[PDB]
Ligand binder design. Structure first.
Ligand SMILES: CN(Cc1ccccc1C(=O)NCc1ccco1)Cc1ccc2c(c1C(=O)O)OC[C@H](CCC(=O)O)O2
Ligand SMILES: CN(Cc1ccccc1C(=O)NCc1ccco1)Cc1ccc2c(c1C(=O)O)OC[C@H](CCC(=O)O)O2
Ligand SMILES: [Cl-]
Ligand SMILES: [Cl-]
Lengths: 149, 149
């Protein structure tokens, strides 16, 4: 579980917010893209895997699962590309709740930036630093350090 | 120590590569931008600070030190903005060598992507995973985890 991430795509303001969640910690990375293509998703994963030890990614839909560009990025970065089928039905709910929380935070910061991308990074910061007590950013570091040790 | 980062700007293919180095570990984050403006630097720091516990940033030049947009991002993210004067003369050398290493890696991957941005992310990945023994990505996690405990 230290290496398991889940992709998630949500929409706001006619744009797409692509999110990666570290399953065990709830820590997130996100970016704003005009639309979700295999190429965008591939690039996002390359970025993520250079920053954290990404072992497995549960893809957000069947098009990204199928995408040869996404498969090429996962090959390149040594990531096991998996489906995102919620065999544990609780997964759907957690993701839904996370998207609603993220959108809430984006609304709370929306007037502090002209561009949606800025508001999204502000939301990422707030989400990752929120003590719920440890923050998600604290949990991910502890989890991975324990793994190295 | 666990919270100090150094900004660094280097050029390739008529584009700018903006880099943040975690001083204690040598772990890096980087992005390709058309030119180094206060706004680009501010957005980059916002991204970085949402992902790692950024306490202090040594800015890469006086323009980014002066930039009110950069100061506004440092205020927003709770970062102490500092100069990057190399009071320790070893700093210039270390940065220079890192830029040289990064450009070498980018050359080694350059034909595996059409776009420079992709090559740069591949280079970040290789740099952060390289065992020197531990990798920089291992070092940063251990340093921050030790700090949390
Ligand atoms: C499609 N490309 C195929 C290619 C072209 C030439 C040489 C090798 C390859 C190859 O298959 N390499 C191995 C591989 C695939 C994925 C990771 O490694 C790779 C690629 C992917 C995503 C991108 C890219 C690029 C690029 O070519 O630079 O460019 C930036 C873009 C930004 C996001 C957006 O704009 O959608 O995301
Ligand atoms: C300049 N802006 C001032 C502003 C405009 C409107 C409302 C509030 C503010 C304000 O001062 N907010 C507090 C603050 C400043 C920095 C961090 O928080 C903030 C901003 C900065 C960098 C960016 C931005 C934006 C943006 O407005 O969205 O947009 C994307 C861009 C991408 C990189 C590139 O294209 O250069 O980087
Ligand atoms: Cl964090
Ligand atoms: Cl890594």
């Amino acid at each position: 579980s230290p290496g398991i991430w889940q992709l998630d795509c949500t929409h706001l303001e006619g744009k797409v917010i692509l999110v990666a969640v570290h399953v065990a910690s709830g820590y997130i990375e996100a970016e704003v893209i005009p639309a979700e293509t295999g190429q965008e998703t591939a690039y996002f994963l390359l970025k993520l895997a250079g920053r954290w030890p990404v072992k497995t990614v549960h893809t957000d839909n069947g098009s990204n699962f199928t995408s040869t560009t996404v498969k090429a990025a996962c090959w390149w970065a040594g990531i096991k590309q998996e489906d995102g089928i919620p065999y544990n039905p609780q997964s759907q709910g957690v993701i839904e709740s996370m998207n609603k929380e993220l959108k809430k935070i984006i609304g709370q910061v929306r007037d502090q930036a002209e561009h949606l991308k800025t508001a999204v990074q502000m939301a990422v910061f707030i989400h990752n630093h929120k003590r719920k007590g440890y923050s998600a950013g604290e949990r991910i570091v502890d989890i991975i350090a324990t793994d190295i040790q």
